Symmetry: D2
Subunit: 231 residues, 4 copies
DNA sequence: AAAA
DNA sequence: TTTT
DNA sequence: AAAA
DNA sequence: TTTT
């Protein structure tokens, strides 16, 4: 299948599949059962911020998710992405809903990759009606107040259940080389998760994948648009 | 047909199509007949450097080509690329040979594009791998040979072949202008090594912005530099 | 005296010194009498944005000032800063009030300078701390008030004071031009909030490049914008 | 005294002060006795490259020193620079010689700092005769083939013993804030260490210090222009 | 995350 | 460097 | 880093 | 908004 490494902003605890009993951030390595998690105090309708970092030296994938005027959440997992991912990858944001639902609004996404030096950088602070350096998969859309809406939102602004959508940057990234001195990537995105319901689901993920990655069929809900099963 | 705006490093004067009677740098807008040129003192087998710049304010496309410890060459043309290009483009390097030949070696290529309605794209190649998947290679272009980009065919001994044409396009489309936008800018830098046995080299290198789906137009070896289907 | 090149956001028309009879943006070169101006539709209490650009190729200094969902203003002047400025400079924001007054609030300031003989300097302020040690604060300028830079004096209730002048210079000198150099460029962006009770605001904000040792010239409140010792 | 955190490229083993019996790279925290070291195969007269990285998340200071076509060296030490350094600092390169000598030539120096976002970046690939965004201390000089020569080199190109010199970037850097989400810095420099003698000494360091840092008197040789004593 |  |  |  |  697809090979996936993601940082999940999981809003809906699924204990059936190893999620803690609380909204959490996790590092996922080729499984939705996160290799490490941390408690995350998600804030309904507040604009939040995610930072994902990694290098070839420390080989440590870390993330930090923040809101204005509140303690942030942070998770870290030592993994050699030489041993998980192919040298060439695409990077993306994925989001899903199931029985329960939420807006998965992205307001900004930036990415920097360095490899010795070769460099790639992009920054989206607005998203146009037809954003041709993005590959939109499933329910993802652009042009709605200059935002990226990963999951379906009706004309009345109401979020839909059983939705899944991703956004991949068009150009493949060189993420690791055998004969390389230093490699690093940084990712930042701002998100707005809103539910009128007292159960928000299912969350957002930054993800690196094989270039040809697709939404695995039925990967709505707990699977967050990343995984075909919950192993 | 393709819509093309290029900065040509033209090494071979083609008088049949308006090229001056000397190696020149020029701005080409939907034609190989440059809108403006300048004398260029090309140095056979010396590593040279090109800088291309533009913004939505001055709407002036300029370029500067340099060698170590020698006077540079410069050309400038006022053009609104809002009126010339589609909003969405790919950026590339093209090179060709014909009857006469030269190595069209690229050692480095960087590109920065910024657009405030800030959105930004930046890439920098200082080495090129055997399989460079964020480049679309067209015709004879190849990567992996001493970490370089070889736009036109080169034998095992580095000896250049005639009647060759190749381009390299960055994979991701670029937002180069928007109607509802305050400031847009791009800069491009690349280093090149043009080498010929004999003091008769051809045909040159170009930085080019095109429609995303741009391909090497049929027969566009030699004078046409991998950009133009005819010489209008 | 100080050697000054500025882009003025002049809110108060001073006819005694050649200002047009409207709020304007202008290029000032060693004089408060702008070398060129343009009408500027200032918006009282709206967060606005300024972009200043220049390169050694076009040798054209341009600026663009914008508000949300409204036509921008633009001004451009051809000047060789090789002939005007010293090689080594400091960059700054200046603001002043006189008889009439306004908040001169800066919310963000970024600067990029590149010079190939590539040498590069980049800074970006999106928040400003209580003690910002990579800024040299001159006169009434202060930091820490809601993470902003307040160039001129503002009461506890945000009410602006008259007869105020303040500047903020980046601490490190910038290499803005070299004799033996191929390409040099700088860009500057800052966001500002100009607010007055009453439709009579004064006196405005400027991005400025100066001799490293530049100080607020004596008496340079009001029309002189913290830049000029007299109005020549 | 001055507060110093450095990555030392130590070419001369001083066993009297805890250096291993081989040329090494080390992390120094307010002492020349490195908190951690690693074997370094220094190459006489070859242009080498150093990378220093750190973030507020992993709070891990790492470095990697490389030459063309040879295995690199890398060292890492977990330290919270909130607890070592002041919020405001200057960054610099220091080099020294003693009884034994070497050219301490710097050909390039770049630095990036990010703090949430506020950012500082500089890159020197050439150094002019009068480089006014550098504070040169002791024997450091610029203009000699566009290089930075940290220690004294005679008119005949011969390196001098008992030399010490540093180069600090002019503008102070915000390296950590109490109420901050993410902070990172990256540093790259290329160096050319050459000795006609069979004993090269004493090495090069990237260093962060109090803004007002000075060459401690007699910090030639083993002390590398950083430390007043060898505790 | 709160009630059965 | 060939062709008018 | 090599010899005493 | 005052002064010619
Ligand atoms: O502090 C945490 C508050 C979250 C609400 C507490 C849980 N409430 C709850 C559960 N728990 C079992 C979860 O599995 C059933 C839901 O499965 C479907 O819905 C989710 C959400 O969209 C999705 O991940 C699945 O794939 C599937 O579509 C209940 O049954 C209940 O109520
Ligand atoms: O013995 C000294 C040789 C020096 C070369 C002289 C070049 N001739 C020349 C021209 N105009 C005629 C050029 O046409 C050449 C034929 O064109 C073919 O070759 C070129 C080079 O690859 C290519 O551009 C064409 O498309 C075609 O393949 C001058 O003005 C001048 O000098
Ligand atoms: O009741 C409606 C009031 C509207 C204000 C009218 C402004 N007057 C005016 C001028 N020219 C005269 C301006 O001189 C004002 C005195 O100058 C002092 O105040 C200003 C503002 O701080 C400052 O620039 C000076 O340096 C000095 O402090 C027009 O053309 C126009 O309109
Ligand atoms: O594989 C490693 C090869 C390096 C040479 C082997 C050591 N040779 C050596 C020593 N060892 C004792 C070192 O302390 C004496 C030198 O001290 C003076 O010189 C150094 C170098 O410039 C400096 O760090 C000190 O501060 C002082 O100036 C010898 O005595 C000998 O020979
Ligand atoms: Ca879940
Ligand atoms: Ca030609
Ligand atoms: Ca005025
Ligand atoms: Ca030592
Ligand atoms: Mn989970
Ligand atoms: Mn031509
Ligand atoms: Mn004015
Ligand atoms: Mn040591």
């Amino acid at each position: 299948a697809d090979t996936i490494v993601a940082v999940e902003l999981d809003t809906y605890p699924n204990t059936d599949i190893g999620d803690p009993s609380y909204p959490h951030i996790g590092i996922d390595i080729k499984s939705v059962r996160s290799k490490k998690t941390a408690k995350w105090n998600m804030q309904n309708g507040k604009v939040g911020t995610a930072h994902i970092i990694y290098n070839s030296v420390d080989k440590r994938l870390s993330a930090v998710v923040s809101y204005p005027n509140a303690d942030s959440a942070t998770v870290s997992y030592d993994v050699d992405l030489d041993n998980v991912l192919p040298e060439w990858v695409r990077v993306g944001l994925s989001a899903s809903t199931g029985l329960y639902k939420e807006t998965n609004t992205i307001l900004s996404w930036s990415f920097t990759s360095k490899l010795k030096t070769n460099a790639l950088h992009f920054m989206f602070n607005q998203f146009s009606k037809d954003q041709k350096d993005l590959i939109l998969q499933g329910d993802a859309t652009t042009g709605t107040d200059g935002n990226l809406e990963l999951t379906r939102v009706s004309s009345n602004g109401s979020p839909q259940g059983s939705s899944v959508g991703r956004a991949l940057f068009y150009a493949p990234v060189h993420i690791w080389e055998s004969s390389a001195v230093v490699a690093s990537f940084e990712a930042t995105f701002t998100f707005l998760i809103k539910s009128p319901d007292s159960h928000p689901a299912d969350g957002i993920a930054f993800f690196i994948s094989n270039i040809d990655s697709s939404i695995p069929s039925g990967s709505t809900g707990r699977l967050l648009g990343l995984f075909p099963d919950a192993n």
